[PDB]
Amino acid sequence: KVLRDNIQGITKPAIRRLARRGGVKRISGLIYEETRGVLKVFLENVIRDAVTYTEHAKRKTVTAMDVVYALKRQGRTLYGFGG
Amino acid sequence: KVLRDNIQGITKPAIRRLARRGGVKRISGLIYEETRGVLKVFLENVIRDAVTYTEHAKRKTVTAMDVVYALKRQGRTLYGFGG
Amino acid sequence: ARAKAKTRSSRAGLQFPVGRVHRLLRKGNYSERVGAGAPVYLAAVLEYLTAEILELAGNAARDNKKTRIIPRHLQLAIRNDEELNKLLGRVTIAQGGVLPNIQAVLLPK
Amino acid sequence: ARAKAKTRSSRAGLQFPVGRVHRLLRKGNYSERVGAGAPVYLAAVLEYLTAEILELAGNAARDNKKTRIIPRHLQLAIRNDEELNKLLGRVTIAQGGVLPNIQAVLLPK
Amino acid sequence: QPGKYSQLVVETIRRLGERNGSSLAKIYTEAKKVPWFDQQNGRTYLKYSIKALVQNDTLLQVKGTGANGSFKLNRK
Amino acid sequence: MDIKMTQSPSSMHASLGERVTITCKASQDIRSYLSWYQQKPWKSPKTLIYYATSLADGVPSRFSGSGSGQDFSLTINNLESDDTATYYCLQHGESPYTFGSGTKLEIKEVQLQQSGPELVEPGTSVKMPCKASGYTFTSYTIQWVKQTPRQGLEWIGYIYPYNAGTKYNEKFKGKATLTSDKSSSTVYMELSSLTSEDSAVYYCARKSSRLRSTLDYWGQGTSVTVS
Amino acid sequence: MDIKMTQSPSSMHASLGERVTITCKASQDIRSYLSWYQQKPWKSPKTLIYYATSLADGVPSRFSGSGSGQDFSLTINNLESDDTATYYCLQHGESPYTFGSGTKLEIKEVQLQQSGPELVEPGTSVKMPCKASGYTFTSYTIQWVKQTPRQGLEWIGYIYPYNAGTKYNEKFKGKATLTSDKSSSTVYMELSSLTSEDSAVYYCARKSSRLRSTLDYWGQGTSVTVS
Amino acid sequence: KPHRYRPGTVALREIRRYQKSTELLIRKLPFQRLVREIAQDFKTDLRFQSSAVMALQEACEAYLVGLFEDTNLCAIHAKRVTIMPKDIQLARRIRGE
Amino acid sequence: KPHRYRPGTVALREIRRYQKSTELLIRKLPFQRLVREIAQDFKTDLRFQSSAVMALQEACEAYLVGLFEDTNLCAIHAKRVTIMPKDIQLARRIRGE
Amino acid sequence: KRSRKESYSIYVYKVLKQVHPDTGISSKAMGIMNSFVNDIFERIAGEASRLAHYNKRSTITSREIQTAVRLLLPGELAKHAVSEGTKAVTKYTSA
Amino acid sequence: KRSRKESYSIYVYKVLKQVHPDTGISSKAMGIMNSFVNDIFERIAGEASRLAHYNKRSTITSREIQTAVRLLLPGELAKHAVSEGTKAVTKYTSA
DNA sequence: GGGCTGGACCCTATACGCGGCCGCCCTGGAGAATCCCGGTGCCGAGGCCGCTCAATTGGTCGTAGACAGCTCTAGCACCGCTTAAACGCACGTACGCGCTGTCCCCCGCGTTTTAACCGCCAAGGGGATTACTCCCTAGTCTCCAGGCACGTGTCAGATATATACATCCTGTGCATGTATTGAACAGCGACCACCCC
DNA sequence: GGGGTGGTCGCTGTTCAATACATGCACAGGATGTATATATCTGACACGTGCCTGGAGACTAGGGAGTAATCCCCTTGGCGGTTAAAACGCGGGGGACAGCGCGTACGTGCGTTTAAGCGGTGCTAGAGCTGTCTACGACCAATTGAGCGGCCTCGGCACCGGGATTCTCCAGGGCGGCCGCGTATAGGGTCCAGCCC
């Protein structure tokens, strides 16, 4: 029921693929933990605003529009999800 | 009437002082021209917006309030002149 | 009373809905008064920008030998242009990917 | 009949002007209508943030053995606190200077 | 009257072998365990020894200059 | 110049249920920056009131507080069995933070992990670590306090991980030094030249840089014993 | 399959103060992407009309453009002595750009610094620089145009300095090569295996990446002569 | 004998592959569980639209890629070719994060 | 008798000096002339408030100071102490300019 | 019975058919183009609102929208959007 | 006869006298604090307007101002501003 | 009458070339990747049909702003003078860069494991809409008091001076290491004082 | 009174002592810079005064927001395979980094020049405000057709299979310079024959 350790679900090969798309040729092994931490920070910051919008609308379901508003408030304007 | 070569008024001592306040210990001699170029680019971007606001107000005098609006539109909100 | 009517878009020579734009300007709390030429001018600008983006994306799709513009083609069209990328510098495009770019020092030789 | 008038600020227990905040909210094109408790809540928040800035700046001025808060003290107060620096991350303080900071590797052995 | 660390390095090169010459790094690492070796200036004494022995042509620089490169004994 | 904080009712007895009041008197004006702390025996203090009026997170509404200036008071309406504990005031309006003498009352997710007991011979030096987790490490100062049965609770000093700023109690200058580790989110307190006087329990305490914030979470206490 | 440009009035004669009209026919629909250029003898072409209707900067209202699809027209209302020049159209609606055959008229600060005349031998290679100033270098493509006295104006290709993208005329692959230097705001076109056929005056031309934007500013021209 | 490629060429092949492709690189279900876990700290028993989870994943992947680009630029500035946590930290800190 | 400090030591004093003070580091009259020379390319015969020139100078110096901070961070990342145009350019590229 | 939602899909499609008669589009690219149109609409609208506030004007005119365009659009985008809008406004006035 | 130009100077000064009775403040620091108050006012009001528009509400209430405060202010500053505003609103309602 | 000298035969120290060996460079081949091309199928993109609600039109009205005119302020232009900052030059030293050496740690790849993905199915929570109502905010008029412009004094800090303490730098002297070299010291060849016959 | 031997002097081999050279370390003191305390003064801020307009109080209108009910959709949960991907393990190579050499780039200081800063003087362009009036945007009633939801098909493209082309890795071979060993060469030692002393 409770979700506990899912940050490790961002696997080593997935981070490698992201780095490849970023143009990274060689990867220090500590980048995995560093990038997991950075991703956790970004997700916490965005989801906090999304849940704030969801609470304000008195809704129990976080909507893609709520996510888009959170991102736009954080300067991460996303096209393609109803914005 | 015409002003031509005033970018050289940002002397190497002045750039040194700015670097010192920035915490720079040793300074390659090309930094002087690189920083003069960067400063000119930033000043052009700000003054263009300031003159746009001045034109919109049908004013022939550029005001500190116009400069503050330009900077804020460029994400560099300046406190102390916005009256 | 109305009669056989027209659109303000047709009067302006525009495809975009000048009437809808005026409604949104008036209901958007942008000002108390909204001049009649403002939605016309704004719809012209909106149509121009949409036309530019769509034409560049169609050129990119043609170069790929695809018939239908996709987010990849929109991303390519926007990123491959200096000032359009400047305007959309902060923007993320879903399913758009990234421009192919490898740094010179990473290549062999 | 008309009687002794008194500010909404005193009624709310606030120093910042509830009435002026309400006037700016209604004249500022933020929405069609402006509920009564909104300027109260806003003036309370404005007063809290102003007090939080001014107390820290006064502490800095006291430490500097100066009686009057100056832009230097305001800058020091803002920058030396993470939350306030985050809130004013994009903000420049005129005549505010910069925090004294030298990187370790630049210091002599 | 050769120096103690001079004898140390000249015999340590033989002990290590390294047909392509031993570098200062590996000779230093192998001589560090010597009992009288000075932990603070032992490397400095080894550098003096290497430069002086190259001046005496008893050691041959395969490449480099000064302490850079690798060293092996000149034949007798 | 230190502001002595004078809790008047040093001890009291009460039956179950009935209302209880505790009053404390400030030596100088502290401008409402006072907090109350409940300490069950052999356990770390938990906060009850901050800014002299505001209920802490998770404390039942049975507690209340009031007062401003120099006179401050605490109230407990519905006494329950677990309420038996020592109640301390804490002023933080002025740089040397001062706790009250403590009132003994008897009747008929943030995690700070702190090291276990320490046995140290005099003249030695010791490093008590502070493990912070569950929150943004750099935003909150870590506050160090010394508890002795003879002198009560004393504030030693604080570390601000954001910029490694320091402030120490004059009684602890040189004696204590504070350092931080952003990489492990850990804080260390150094004690130099241990003395028999230093046999005490030390608590690390989280406190945001907000002026009205108080010591909200406490470590389990590192019991340092000098032989 | 190149779009053929067909200026009908190859030559006209007119007096002062009367009207002159020039027409242009395309082989395929170009959707108004057409521009008009005035070239005085031994002078770089100056643009007059762009997007088939719009006056260029610094061009007086005496010049009027018209038409869309395949039929386009240029009109000059009040001819003057200075108007004696040859006028070319240019379509840029399809990737290989095509200039018109040229129409001769007889009446009875952005700077692109270009290299001087170069005399060269067959079989060698030649590199010509364009030094741009007065504008943001990376935002505009640089267009290279070859003007023979027999085949008129011809478009070689362009380089887009923002990402070093290039496009070449099928007649000029291998023959020409384009490279850009951001630091010096200078672009080089290299010609390989020079031939007597390559004896022509080459013009560098700035063109924005905007589709309706045309070749607006032109360099003074660098004459290449092959023995 | 088994054929083998030299180190660093399959890296370039992968770089070109993923700079051409556009699909999402992080496993969707693990990222869904991660988002649910992180949101559990702000409100209990939340629900998420599939489109909301997808928008989150797009934004995070784009942020990560844009960060790795700057990381690689810093690594090259250090005359290295391996990205390091000190490179990531310098990139983030210059960005202001 | 002539006396000299070691190079790299007066620099620390100068850094501490200017990190203390708050006044403008760029000469006001030539910065004013530079502003007029830049603006005349956008509109001729403009007027400028003294407060507008001062505000421009404040913003320019603050931008330059933050840029040099990022530049010094890049130089230290390169295991150097000298800032170079490649350091400035890297800082600008990460910042987003 | 069910509620309606407005979009720019049909106008984007008509502009697509005008600029490239044979080239089609996709649902996701149409969503991206809707978002792009909405975003720039909001940007110029907000900037014109601030221009009116800064100049103490109750009304958003075509001059305010023009100045907002000159502020937000870089380089030649500004020039060409100003020309497009000026042409549209002159045509609307004449008609 | 020149007309008035309103500001927050007297209000900032009175809050200063409340938090630090004997300290002064310079004109420049007063200007900077006035700008700070204007900036934070604009930020909160803009976010509240956006919340109302997103929720289709015509009115800006204390709930929208609270949510704007929670969004724009970080960490403990958010909850302290929330407490300040809630106390002020409850007092104002109790009259 | 026999060794010396001359010429010739033999012992031996030596510069140099050929065979062996390791490295440099080339290239063909194995093979794995990538691209072009065709066949298939499927699901979403584009078009049509129905309807409903919002966009249009004609008319009225009120006030926002366009326009004229006036004022007064602050922005610019100029001139003189002092002096501090900038510049030009010398000089030196430490830092950046090149080069080499070491080793370890990430890349490539084979093998095993597992859990993401997808298809299918079900439950039910809540998101959205509609109907109703009531109370909460806009709007208006009165009127008074709070806040802003202006004036004034005094004291906080800016300035000038002196002093006391701190850090830097260098010059000196001593404690490690290294190689260099003249002579102090002892062994043997050779001249002499002195014993033996 | 000579033959002959150990003693002793002179020449010389051995090595050790001082000689000479290079850096790490400690410290004293000269030099400059900074932190601190005191006296002067001036203009910037804090407070008082006049008033006028904008905020408060009282009351009205209506429409926007709260609340109860209903539907259904869309989110969550579960289950069973099926691989595709992730995890794991191992060999190695090439990249990170540590160390040193060097030279030149750039900091530090001194003398010179200039041009910034400050003040005073003068002027007028234009910012700001008020007053007039009209055109233009708001608002309303009626209308109708444009735009969106639902349905449907059919072709663009995604996938699969198969060659064709290209790029990468490397093993072997061709080609060249350096190393190991023997040789043509001559310097010198040694043997045979004629001759001078």
PDB file of C-alpha atoms (C1' of nucleotides) in Angstrom, chain L residues 97-193:
ATOM      1  C1'  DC L  97      50.079  24.416 -20.140  1.00  0.00           C
ATOM      2  C1'  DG L  98      52.654  20.644 -22.064  1.00  0.00           C
ATOM      3  C1'  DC L  99      54.506  16.138 -21.198  1.00  0.00           C
ATOM      4  C1'  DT L 100      54.963  11.647 -18.985  1.00  0.00           C
ATOM      5  C1'  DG L 101      53.734   7.925 -15.944  1.00  0.00           C
ATOM      6  C1'  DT L 102      50.484   5.147 -13.146  1.00  0.00           C
ATOM      7  C1'  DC L 103      46.403   2.716 -12.098  1.00  0.00           C
ATOM      8  C1'  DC L 104      41.540   2.132 -11.700  1.00  0.00           C
ATOM      9  C1'  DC L 105      37.229   2.388 -13.027  1.00  0.00           C
ATOM     10  C1'  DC L 106      34.041   2.719 -16.420  1.00  0.00           C
ATOM     11  C1'  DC L 107      32.843   0.554 -21.157  1.00  0.00           C
ATOM     12  C1'  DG L 108      31.687  -3.470 -23.807  1.00  0.00           C
ATOM     13  C1'  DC L 109      29.544  -7.615 -23.669  1.00  0.00           C
ATOM     14  C1'  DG L 110      27.751 -12.370 -22.241  1.00  0.00           C
ATOM     15  C1'  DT L 111      24.318 -14.566 -18.977  1.00  0.00           C
ATOM     16  C1'  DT L 112      20.531 -14.584 -15.555  1.00  0.00           C
ATOM     17  C1'  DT L 113      16.607 -12.433 -13.457  1.00  0.00           C
ATOM     18  C1'  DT L 114      12.703  -9.792 -12.945  1.00  0.00           C
ATOM     19  C1'  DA L 115       9.153  -6.720 -13.464  1.00  0.00           C
ATOM     20  C1'  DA L 116       7.355  -3.274 -17.104  1.00  0.00           C
ATOM     21  C1'  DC L 117       3.957  -3.503 -20.505  1.00  0.00           C
ATOM     22  C1'  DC L 118      -0.202  -4.868 -22.321  1.00  0.00           C
ATOM     23  C1'  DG L 119      -4.508  -6.856 -22.621  1.00  0.00           C
ATOM     24  C1'  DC L 120      -8.574  -7.708 -20.101  1.00  0.00           C
ATOM     25  C1'  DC L 121     -11.981  -6.875 -16.318  1.00  0.00           C
ATOM     26  C1'  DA L 122     -14.190  -5.005 -12.505  1.00  0.00           C
ATOM     27  C1'  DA L 123     -15.586  -1.533  -8.733  1.00  0.00           C
ATOM     28  C1'  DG L 124     -16.733   2.571  -7.344  1.00  0.00           C
ATOM     29  C1'  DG L 125     -15.071   7.549  -6.078  1.00  0.00           C
ATOM     30  C1'  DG L 126     -15.532  11.653  -7.358  1.00  0.00           C
ATOM     31  C1'  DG L 127     -15.658  15.341 -11.261  1.00  0.00           C
ATOM     32  C1'  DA L 128     -18.847  17.750 -13.560  1.00  0.00           C
ATOM     33  C1'  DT L 129     -23.207  19.361 -14.306  1.00  0.00           C
ATOM     34  C1'  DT L 130     -27.888  21.272 -12.823  1.00  0.00           C
ATOM     35  C1'  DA L 131     -31.271  23.276  -9.812  1.00  0.00           C
ATOM     36  C1'  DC L 132     -32.035  26.482  -6.047  1.00  0.00           C
ATOM     37  C1'  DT L 133     -31.174  30.139  -2.939  1.00  0.00           C
ATOM     38  C1'  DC L 134     -29.233  33.566  -0.097  1.00  0.00           C
ATOM     39  C1'  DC L 135     -25.999  36.535   1.352  1.00  0.00           C
ATOM     40  C1'  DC L 136     -21.936  39.242  -0.032  1.00  0.00           C
ATOM     41  C1'  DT L 137     -19.950  42.496  -2.868  1.00  0.00           C
ATOM     42  C1'  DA L 138     -20.562  46.519  -6.312  1.00  0.00           C
ATOM     43  C1'  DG L 139     -22.420  50.835  -6.472  1.00  0.00           C
ATOM     44  C1'  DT L 140     -23.909  55.555  -4.497  1.00  0.00           C
ATOM     45  C1'  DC L 141     -23.858  59.487  -1.415  1.00  0.00           C
ATOM     46  C1'  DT L 142     -22.061  61.779   2.584  1.00  0.00           C
ATOM     47  C1'  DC L 143     -18.396  63.432   5.450  1.00  0.00           C
ATOM     48  C1'  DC L 144     -14.469  63.464   8.214  1.00  0.00           C
ATOM     49  C1'  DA L 145      -9.850  62.261   9.444  1.00  0.00           C
ATOM     50  C1'  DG L 146      -5.610  60.105   7.860  1.00  0.00           C
ATOM     51  C1'  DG L 147      -2.030  60.522   5.160  1.00  0.00           C
ATOM     52  C1'  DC L 148       0.892  63.429   2.114  1.00  0.00           C
ATOM     53  C1'  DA L 149       3.421  67.976   0.922  1.00  0.00           C
ATOM     54  C1'  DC L 150       6.262  71.322   3.175  1.00  0.00           C
ATOM     55  C1'  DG L 151       9.114  73.303   6.910  1.00  0.00           C
ATOM     56  C1'  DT L 152      12.423  72.836  10.651  1.00  0.00           C
ATOM     57  C1'  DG L 153      15.794  71.300  13.906  1.00  0.00           C
ATOM     58  C1'  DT L 154      19.304  68.106  15.748  1.00  0.00           C
ATOM     59  C1'  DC L 155      22.182  64.157  15.901  1.00  0.00           C
ATOM     60  C1'  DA L 156      24.180  60.034  13.336  1.00  0.00           C
ATOM     61  C1'  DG L 157      27.368  59.099  10.813  1.00  0.00           C
ATOM     62  C1'  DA L 158      30.841  60.886   7.434  1.00  0.00           C
ATOM     63  C1'  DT L 159      35.500  62.933   7.870  1.00  0.00           C
ATOM     64  C1'  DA L 160      39.856  63.908   9.789  1.00  0.00           C
ATOM     65  C1'  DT L 161      43.649  62.326  13.042  1.00  0.00           C
ATOM     66  C1'  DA L 162      46.196  59.548  15.908  1.00  0.00           C
ATOM     67  C1'  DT L 163      47.399  55.006  17.855  1.00  0.00           C
ATOM     68  C1'  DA L 164      47.759  50.187  18.752  1.00  0.00           C
ATOM     69  C1'  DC L 165      47.787  45.814  16.915  1.00  0.00           C
ATOM     70  C1'  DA L 166      48.278  42.171  12.920  1.00  0.00           C
ATOM     71  C1'  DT L 167      49.880  40.181   8.914  1.00  0.00           C
ATOM     72  C1'  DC L 168      53.352  39.916   5.330  1.00  0.00           C
ATOM     73  C1'  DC L 169      57.773  39.303   3.758  1.00  0.00           C
ATOM     74  C1'  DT L 170      62.575  38.680   3.869  1.00  0.00           C
ATOM     75  C1'  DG L 171      67.065  38.117   5.671  1.00  0.00           C
ATOM     76  C1'  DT L 172      69.681  35.063   8.641  1.00  0.00           C
ATOM     77  C1'  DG L 173      71.038  31.097  10.736  1.00  0.00           C
ATOM     78  C1'  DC L 174      70.669  26.093  11.435  1.00  0.00           C
ATOM     79  C1'  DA L 175      69.486  21.096  10.001  1.00  0.00           C
ATOM     80  C1'  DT L 176      68.678  17.450   6.065  1.00  0.00           C
ATOM     81  C1'  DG L 177      70.491  15.758   1.731  1.00  0.00           C
ATOM     82  C1'  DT L 178      73.957  15.617  -2.437  1.00  0.00           C
ATOM     83  C1'  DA L 179      78.614  15.510  -5.083  1.00  0.00           C
ATOM     84  C1'  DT L 180      83.688  17.346  -5.292  1.00  0.00           C
ATOM     85  C1'  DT L 181      88.585  17.391  -4.183  1.00  0.00           C
ATOM     86  C1'  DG L 182      93.299  18.423  -1.553  1.00  0.00           C
ATOM     87  C1'  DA L 183      95.817  16.311   1.492  1.00  0.00           C
ATOM     88  C1'  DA L 184      96.609  13.192   5.966  1.00  0.00           C
ATOM     89  C1'  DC L 185      98.170   8.817   6.432  1.00  0.00           C
ATOM     90  C1'  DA L 186     100.460   4.421   5.560  1.00  0.00           C
ATOM     91  C1'  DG L 187     103.119   0.880   2.113  1.00  0.00           C
ATOM     92  C1'  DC L 188     106.913   0.039  -0.608  1.00  0.00           C
ATOM     93  C1'  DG L 189     111.324   1.212  -3.531  1.00  0.00           C
ATOM     94  C1'  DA L 190     115.737   2.907  -2.657  1.00  0.00           C
ATOM     95  C1'  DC L 191     119.966   5.332  -0.142  1.00  0.00           C
ATOM     96  C1'  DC L 192     122.568   5.050   4.020  1.00  0.00           C
ATOM     97  C1'  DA L 193     124.467   3.811   9.173  1.00  0.00           C
TER      98       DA L 193
END
